Design a binder for this molecule. Structure first.
Ligand SMILES: *Cc1c(COP(=O)(O)O)cnc(C)c1O
Ligand SMILES: *Cc1c(COP(=O)(O)O)cnc(C)c1O
Lengths: 322, 322
């Protein structure tokens, strides 16, 4: 399984079973202070600082065909984000994983979006001593796999703009390697994209370089070489997988500063994210990207990315039997 | 009532009554989808985009001695913030005010922190059509008045640092005139201040100008003239009241770019915010601000700001009798 047709046929088959389910957890499940609740019924304390000041980090691993994909990479990134924020995982890792796998199994969901959120808790940083800020809260949930680009659009590629009315929050305000939900710039980018008849905004760093978009990294392909911005962006696990895939497929990939001009000169463009995978861009600022077709290197990356989902090195099988 | 002793003595007497109250709502009350809930019991949906992507705006008016202070100014600012964010107030203004005054009356709180939050609702911007993003959510709560600087400390002033490890989110990322809860830079500032043995961080715009701090505006006084940053900051209602007070007292106040160097040259420094009022700063970067005492112009502004709380132009009396 890794041509688009094969990957999507498997998804379609599993999705048909899931859409027919009468399981009250089939639309997702949340873990709230040690209790499982259907996702759409889940509630959190008003006073949680994750809401009061978006004072949190989070991470989103995924399950594909009943297999957790790169879960340890996501959990290590979450731990790193927590350390940077002076937060601590409220449960030890074996309990986190045990709980996630139980949630997935109970839901019956085979292709899942999985989110963990660690918040400061009920006491705000403002006016507190460090010792008063150690009771951090954890929220976790799973839901049916989410597509930032629908399967059918991945065949043709999507429409992007380089945002001109907004730029990325600079690392000296918020470190973008700490995964966070402070989406003020990204939401402005989304509205700009919609106003300009596109779906995906690419944000600059306000100094004429490409950064990332609204929840995805961006990779440019130029003369058989892949390029992706180093600074100013989340170091995506999908991006990590694209770096692995490039080397697997025998291409070079450069993680470095990418002048915005390079977007206009690119042979192929793709976006990457856990919620959707490898997402080609074939129109930029209302003009085709080269010939306006999904490029061959993109297709090689696409196939290898998905093939990784069935390899032990990158995934593990969840037991759904209860 | 306008000298510190008199204003704080009134608060202390009301507080003693409030602390002795057995009414569970004396600790605060929230409005959640048309229902009043004790504040610490209040819960919001996990899927609310106000939590999921901090996709919201808010505003914080106040009640002092049973009088709402400049409520219309806060509601107009909240309406202006909503318009900029493509949000709409979920209730008409007469219902908002009626609900807030009912909540205050039920709680018995005479000196109150009041918060209104308007979120995108349960549907995220990413992947939506404009018409799918109109079901916005409202949350409101009141709690006992919050002090960003305690009354006793206001006599002698607090310790600030100019932040060096973080700068303010630029307006080209997030417009700081839209009041918001995306505090990543402000929380970084709070941690830096605590690491450096201070309480209040002043953030620069990353281009050697003063902006604001973690939930307060900053006003410098130099040779009898007041100065406060124009760009890069929330246009505070307390700041508005300081502008009013300055003119009332016969001082000039300039709202303009304030090079960071001016902070070090200032005769007096104050912070201003709804949650605590007029808060003198007497130590900056471990050095006294001039003689290290609360200055005379600060004290004039202080008294006038508080006197405005009993004037009909700026306040209205809540009826607590049921
Ligand atoms: C999560 C995220 C991405 C993609 O990261 P993955 O680990 O590939 O899912 C890209 N940009 C931003 C801003 C993000 O928060
Ligand atoms: C609310 C706020 C202030 C102070 O505004 P007031 O209207 O005086 O309460 C200052 N800075 C920031 C960043 C704020 O959100």
């Amino acid at each position: 399984m890794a041509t688009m047709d094969k990957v999507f046929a498997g998804y379609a088959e599993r999705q048909a079973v899931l859409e027919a389910s009468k399981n009250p957890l089939a639309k997702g499940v949340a873990w709230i202070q040690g209790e499982l609740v259907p996702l759409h019924e889940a509630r959190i304390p008003l006073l949680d600082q994750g809401f009061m000041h978006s004072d949190l980090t989070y991470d989103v691993p995924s399950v594909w065909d009943g297999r957790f994909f790169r879960l340890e990479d996501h959990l290590n990134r979450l731990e790193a984000s927590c350390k940077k924020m002076r937060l601590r995982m409220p449960l030890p890792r074996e309990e986190v994983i045990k709980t996630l796998v139980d949630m997935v199994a109970k839901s019956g969901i085979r292709d899942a979006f999985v989110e963990l959120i660690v918040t400061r808790g009920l006491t705000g940083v403002r006016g507190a001593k460090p010792e008063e800020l150690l009771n951090n809260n954890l929220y976790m949930f799973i839901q049916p796999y989410v597509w930032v680009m629908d399967p059918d659009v991945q065949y043709t590629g999507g429409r992007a703009i380089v945002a001109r009315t907004v730029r990325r929050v600079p690392p000296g305000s918020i470190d973008p390697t700490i995964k966070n939900l402070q989406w003020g710039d990204l939401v402005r980018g989304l509205f700009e994209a919609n106003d300009r008849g596109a779906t995906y905004p690419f944000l600059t760093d306000g100094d004429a370089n490409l950064t990332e978009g609204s929840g995805f990294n961006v990779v440019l392909i130029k003369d058989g070489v892949l390029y992706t911005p180093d600074r100013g962006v989340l170091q995506g696990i999908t991006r990590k997988s694209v770096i692995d895939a490039a080397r697997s497929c025998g291409y070079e990939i450069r993680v470095e500063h990418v002048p915005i001009e390079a977007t206009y000169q690119a042979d192929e463009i793709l976006m990457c994210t856990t919620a959707g995978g490898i997402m080609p861009i074939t129109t930029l600022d209302d003009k085709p990207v080269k010939d306006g077709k999904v490029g061959p290197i993109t297709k090689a990356i696409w196939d290898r990315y998905w093939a990784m989902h069935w390899e032990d090195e990158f995934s593990f099988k969840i037991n759904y039997l209860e």
